[PDB]
Design a protein around this ligand. Structure first.
Ligand SMILES: CC(C)c1nc(CN(C)C(=O)N[C@H](C(=O)N[C@@H](Cc2ccccc2)C[C@H](O)[C@H](Cc2ccccc2)NC(=O)OCc2cncs2)C(C)C)cs1
Lengths: 99, 99
């Protein structure tokens, strides 16, 4: 679909068998989700944004379904104030910015 | 134009007579630019991001030209690690996410 921006671009994602809402975030290189249950191995990593950095857990090759599209990629888990779907995954579902 | 996301969505903006590059950021409610010279009055404000928060200066109704489109709106200036064009201005140039 086409999503205009007067409102936060929140979409429904299914990951690890759970349903969550997250922001389609063109300004994020990576995808970061609030503390959640994920299967597999994971290396600790650190990500930063406005305000500073957060310690997070990097899980590689996770399957995720965004607003209906599937993609596989890296998902970071941590105390993020908001679930963010970053470019690593937006490219996969073929998301583009248009004006 | 249409902008895909394999690379950071950096565009050229002209604001306060100066040229800068900034990120089209659907994940940002507001537009925050690095320490720069702006004319007019401004109230102090505080914004937060992934790693916490930053203190910035809020300037209202600033004219800005993004990748060729003009818009008027609020611009915050501060020690942001990156110039971000948020939804307040992206709506103005008619930007939409499409997949
Ligand atoms: C509380 C919560 C439910 C929400 N609040 C808001 C409102 N807020 C605060 C914002 O929009 N705030 C913006 C912001 O930081 N947005 C963020 C999402 C977010 C929202 C709330 C809390 C934490 C993170 C999302 C933005 O795309 C920023 C922009 C950016 C890029 C480089 C350097 C600095 C900044 N990106 C990131 O923080 O990316 C982190 C990464 C992802 N992959 C790798 S690092 C500011 C720039 C204005 C939306 S959702």
């Amino acid at each position: 679909p086409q999503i205009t921006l007067w409102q936060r671009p929140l979409v429904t994602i299914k990951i690890g068998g759970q349903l969550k809402e997250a922001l389609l975030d063109t300004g994020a290189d990576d995808t970061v989700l609030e503390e959640m249950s994920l299967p597999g191995a994971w290396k600790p990593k650190m990500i930063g944004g406005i305000g500073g950095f957060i310690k997070v857990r990097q899980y590689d090759q996770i399957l995720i379904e965004i607003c209906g599209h599937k993609a596989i990629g890296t998902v970071l888990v941590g105390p993020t104030p908001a679930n963010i779907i970053g470019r690593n995954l937006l490219t996969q579902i073929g998301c583009t910015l248009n004006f």
